[PDB]
Amino acid sequence: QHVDAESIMTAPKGKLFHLQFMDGLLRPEPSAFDPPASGEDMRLIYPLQPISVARSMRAIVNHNEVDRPRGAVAPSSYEMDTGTLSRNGDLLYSPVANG
Amino acid sequence: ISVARSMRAIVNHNEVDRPRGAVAPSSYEMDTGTLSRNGDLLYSPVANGQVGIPKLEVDHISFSNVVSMMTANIRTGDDMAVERVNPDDVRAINIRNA
Amino acid sequence: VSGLLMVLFKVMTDNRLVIVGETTTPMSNTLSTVVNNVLRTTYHNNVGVN
Amino acid sequence: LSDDFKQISDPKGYLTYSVKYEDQFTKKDKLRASEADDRIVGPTVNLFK
C-alpha cells in the first residue's frame, strides 16, 4: 500500500489510512562481495508517537550464538506470573514476598 | 600377532566373571581431551597439567577428538566480481619509473 | 612395503574440510543419565562408534 | 431451564498471540524433545518457531 506524498497532504479528515513501517531488525548482513550501492535510500514518513505497543516480544533469533541481537525484546514478566485468586474471585499477581 | 586387536571376547563368562583372554578396550581409546594452545589435540591431563598429545605420545590410537569444523557450508554464492576500466588512450600510459 | 607408501601419500594429501551435518539435540529426559554426561548437547546426527 | 450461560470446553480468550516469522532463518541443529513434553510445550514453541 503506497502512500504518496500528494495524498498524505490532501486526505479528508476522516479517512484513516493504513501505513506500514519496516521491521528492519531481522535483515541479514549484506555480503562481503555485494556490489556497492551508489545512491542512498530516502525515507519521509515517520510516526510522531511510539508505535508498536502490541509488541509482546520481538527478534527471536540468536545474534552470533549467545549475545541478544539489539532491539530484541523478550517477553515481560507479568505476561506469565499467573498468581492465585483473591479472598473473593479477582485473580491477582504473585506477591513479591510482601503480601 | 594380533596387534590390531582393540578388545576381544565380548561375552559373559558365568554371568559376572570376565572370560580369560578377554581384553576390554584401552583407556586411551576414549580419553578425548582438549586441544593444545595451538591446534594439536592432546589427551586429558592426569591432574598434573599438560598431556601426552596423541602422536607425540605412544601409539594408542584414540577414537574420539575435538575436531573443529565449519559451522556451515563455506562456498555459497556471492562470488567476488570486480569492474574493470581500461585506460582510454593506450599512448599516454606512463609505464616508466621503477 | 608399497601399500604403506601410497597410503602415507593419501594421508599426505587429505585436503578436505568439514561441515556440521544434521546434528540433533535431545535434552536430558529424552535419553539416559549415563550417556547424558557423555553428551554435551547437540551430538552430531550421524554419530560414530566408540 | 434458562440458558443464561454456555458451557464451552476449551475457552478462547480475547487477546491472543500472533507471530510473523522472517521465513529464511532456521537453526539447523534440530531439537527434538520428549514425545509427551512435545505435547505440553507443543504449540507454544511451535508457534514460537
Binding site: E29, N62, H63, E65 | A72, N73 | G21 | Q24, F25, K28
Partner: peptide
Amino acid sequence: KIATASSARQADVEKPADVTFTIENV
C-alpha cells in the same frame, strides 16, 4: 541350525556438504 560365522565392518557415510539456503543468526 549349525552355528554360523559372521563379520561386520563399521559403516561410512561422507556426503559432500549439502549447500543450504538459510542463514541462522542475524
